[PDB]
Each structure stands twice: as C-alpha cells, then as structure tokens.
Amino acid sequence: GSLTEDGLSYKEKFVVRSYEVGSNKTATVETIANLLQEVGCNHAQSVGFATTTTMRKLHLIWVTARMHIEIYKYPAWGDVVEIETWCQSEGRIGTRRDWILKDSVTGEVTGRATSKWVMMNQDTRRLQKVSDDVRDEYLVFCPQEPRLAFPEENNRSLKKIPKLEDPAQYSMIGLKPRRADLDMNQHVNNVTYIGWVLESIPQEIVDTHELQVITLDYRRECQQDDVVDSLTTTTSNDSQFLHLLRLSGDGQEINRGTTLWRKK
Amino acid sequence: GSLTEDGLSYKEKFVVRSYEVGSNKTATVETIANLLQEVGCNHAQSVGFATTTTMRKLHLIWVTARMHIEIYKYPAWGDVVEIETWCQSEGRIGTRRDWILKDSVTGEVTGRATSKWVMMNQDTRRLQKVSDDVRDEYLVFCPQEPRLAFPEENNRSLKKIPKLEDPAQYSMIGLKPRRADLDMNQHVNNVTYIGWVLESIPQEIVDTHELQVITLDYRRECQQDDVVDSLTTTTSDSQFLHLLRLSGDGQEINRGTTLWRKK
Ligand SMILES: C[C@@H]1CCCCN1C(=O)c1cnccn1
Ligand SMILES: C[C@@H]1CCCCN1C(=O)c1cnccn1
C-alpha cells in the first residue's frame, strides 16, 4: 500500500482469503467492510497517526455516525481488490472518508463507500463541533476541491432513515458479542453491527440475492455484556428492507438502516 | 506463496491486518488458526485440489478430528508471519497436516501446529478408513520420511483429553453461530469452535495472560440452528479443561485443554 503522488489519498491491493468468503462463494459484506477499515488505518498510519496530538490531549475521538456501501461485483477467493481511500473536512460538522473499490485485473469499479465521522469526548460520550485548531491539523492530508465517491445530486447515501415500527416482519433475538468481536481497545467492532443487521434478513433472500446497497446509522455503542435484537421489514426484481438494532431489554436503539438486494 | 524446491511443502508470508488483532494488541488465537487454514488451502490449490476426484465420486471428505497449536510469540498489527505447511499419510487411520510459524524479520520459530484428519462420507457422516487407491494419489505430494512439527516422543499433542464433569467452574451459555461463522459450503467453520471454547475462560485470565497451548478434539458438527454451552474448569501457568455441548440435550460437540502464561 502507498499514498498516491499528490499525498492526498492512499491505495492498497488486498488478496481475498479463504476465511473471508461466505455461502455465496464470494467475499461477504462484512469482508468488504473489514478491507475498508484496513485501508483506512494504513492511510492514517502513512501520515503519522485517527487522532491528532490535540485530540488525545482533550480526550477526543472520531466516531462513525453513518456508513454507506454499494457493491456491483463481489470478489471471489484469491481475487485481488484495489481500494483507494481519502478524507475530507465537512466544516464544523465532522469528517468524511470515501473509498473506491476496483478489480485489479480489469481496472473497473466494483464498489464504492462513504462514511460520516463526528467528534466525541471518549469519557462523557458528548459530541462536539470541530474546533479550528483540529480542523487545520488534518486539512493538510485532504484534497481541497470536493472529491466524492457518491457525487450525484440526489443519490442514496444522504437519505434519512426512518425508525422501524413494531411488529417487525422478521427478527433475530438475543445476539451477543463474543470476545473476537472486540478491537484492540476492548470496544465492539463497527463491522459486527453489519453482521447483526443481516441476521434478520430472511434465508430465502440470502440464498437467491446479493446485497447491492447498505446504509447504516450508528446511534449508540453496544457494550461487551449487552444483548441485541435485530429487526427487519420489507419496504419494497429488487428487494428493500428497513432495519433496526435495539437492546434486548429496554429496547434502546443502537442502529437503524436500509439494505437493497438484487436477484443473482 | 509457493511450493518449496522439492514440491513437498508450501510457504506463504501474511501481513497481520487491523481487524485481525484483539484486546491483547496482537493477533488472536482465532487469527492464527485462520492463517493456518489459508496456507493449507493455498497448498492444496497449488497441487490441483482437499478432495481427490476418487473421493468426490464416493462422496468422501477429510474432516478435522484433532487440532493442536502452540504459540511462543503473537505477531502485532502490520507484522509479517511466514508459515510453512506440509501433509503426511498416517496409514489407514488418516492424514496429518503440520505447520511452522516464523517471524519474517528474525527467522525465529514463533509457533507450531498439527492436525489429525479422518475420512468421512459427507452424507451419512460415517468414518470409513483410508483405501489404498486414495493414498497413491496424495502420497506424491507428501514427504516420505516422517516430518513432524511436534517430534518429541509422547509430547503435548498426543495426550488424551478427559470429559469435563458437572458442575463446571466457568460457563458461557446460549452461544449461536451467525451467518458469518459459515464457510462457502454453509458449514460452521472449525475456527468458530476455538472462539466458543475461549468464551468461558475467566476475564481475569484473558486480561493478564497469553494462550501458550490449545488442544481441541472435534466430536460432532454444530448446525446453523444449534445452540452451544461453553464449559471450563481449572486443572492447575494456568491449565483448563474445556467442553462444548449442545445447550439442550447436552450432546458433546468438542473437548479440549488450554495452557496460559502470565504476560
Ligand atoms: C449471504 C452472505 C452470507 C453472510 C450473511 C450475509 N452475506 C453477505 O454478506 C453477502 C455476500 N455476498 C453478497 C451479498 N451478501
Ligand atoms: C485475549 C484474546 C481476546 C480474544 C479472545 C481470546 N484472545 C486470544 O485469542 C489471545 C490469546 N492469547 C494471546 C493473544 N490473543
């Protein structure tokens, strides 16, 4: 992996490993998300980092508020995927990270992703607008003119997701994180929520369709000892679903989202 | 990755990715096992496969009966691990696959593993013992003189594991496989059982110790709709006896032992 010539984006090639392919005989949505995270971490490392020394001082961290992924073609075991990632400031609202996924052999775009990140105090969990000092620290590593993975004036990455109404059409109850679902900082990995949302999609859809689009809003972190319920209702050749992740007990919302699936 | 000069073993280098590192700030036992599987798959592919066309006709598959892993040093995020793997016939009993893990920079052995594989009919689930026809087709890819990752005459990898007696000292109940725990053939992958066994190790041990040895016996496959209980009792460095069983009838799926060293 390496930063591109202008030092304003990073590119890396990844082989799809055997343990990364699912029932569909190709990489899963979760494998794609894992690869997006890995290329994002390597980009931040290549420029001396997520947190600047000013953020560490004030106990501030970047947290994902929204993730939007669209896949046109899933790579098979042994295929090489080339991913280009970059960051951009969004004024005082937060930061955005975008990705372009390509087939290494054909050079064609096989997927694209975008994510909204907000600033939060690590301890109190209180969100805050980006200060001017923090803004200038990461602006030197970002393109100045807007560069969007989803440029379109009325695309699907900026749609507001409604809250699922009870009764849900489908559900998967009592989902618990395992010790493997935790990262280096003992927190539940953002990829785990993608898996949990897909747990309540009916088996028939999983067997005959491929996920084309996924939009996921993050509302609350799930602790190691929390239990989650995954809820899904069809909202629609193509199937659409509205999703809701909530705590098994009090029903406190942790995530909401939408998925769009295409017939194999 | 590539086969070595004699074509009797395969070597590959792997970078440890960010999503592969755990609470310990290093690769997990599950990440190591995933890397062993990947290098094993690439070795079978490099020689045209690990079912031969004769096994395919008769509906026979190789199944793991025992897995034994020993880790001396866990790689950190971004570290490159070099793994060498090879196979060997064990008469009519089955096959063995061994691995040697090395640090790419220092060349030192950071871990080693061994596994016993038995022949089974994928439909009836019946053990069948290895035929003579299926032997001459895989012996051409195996070293002829014995080559053992664990050579020591009666060491840790060949110790019989006893069955845990109730009440268990520790337990983690209601463990269900997710759709991500299934492989390309819709089966629960063998790495998932390693995770489930480690779920009942006390948090105190996990936070202050590193796993040094793991021996896991496979008795029954867990289906997508099965629920499992993970049981652990200290038998002692800390040693544990483990048992995975179905949440309902208590039907055994796995038994094992772990040895942990203070960080
Ligand atoms: C059906 C699989 C199995 C795991 C659960 C969901 N899946 C995916 O993430 C996927 C993979 N490829 C295409 C579309 N979706
Ligand atoms: C404690 C971690 C966290 C995940 C569950 C078990 N662990 C390991 O697999 C491990 C064990 N020893 C050293 C490094 N990692």
From Swiss-Prot, chain A:
GO terms under cellular component: chloroplast
Catalytic activity: (9Z)-octadecenoyl-[ACP] + H2O = (9Z)-octadecenoate + holo-[ACP] + H(+)
Active site: N185, H187, C222
Entry's localization field: Plastid, Chloroplast
Highest rank taxon of the organism: Eukaryota
Enzyme class: hydrolase
EC number: 3.1.2.14
Coiled coil stretches, renumbered: none
GO BP: any one term: fatty acid biosynthetic process
Broad class of the protein's primary localization: plastid
Keywords: Chloroplast, Fatty acid biosynthesis, Fatty acid metabolism, Hydrolase, Lipid biosynthesis, Lipid metabolism, Plastid, Transit peptide
A molecular-function term among this protein's GO annotations: fatty acyl-[ACP] hydrolase activity
Task performed by this protein: Plays an essential role in chain termination during de novo fatty acid synthesis. Possesses high thioesterase activity for oleoyl-ACP versus other acyl-ACPs. Substrate preference is 18:1 > 18:0 > 16:1.
Family: Belongs to the acyl-ACP thioesterase family.
Protein name (database record): Oleoyl-acyl carrier protein thioesterase 1, chloroplastic
Organism per entry: Arabidopsis thaliana
Taxonomic lineage from the root: Eukaryota, Viridiplantae, Streptophyta, Embryophyta, Tracheophyta
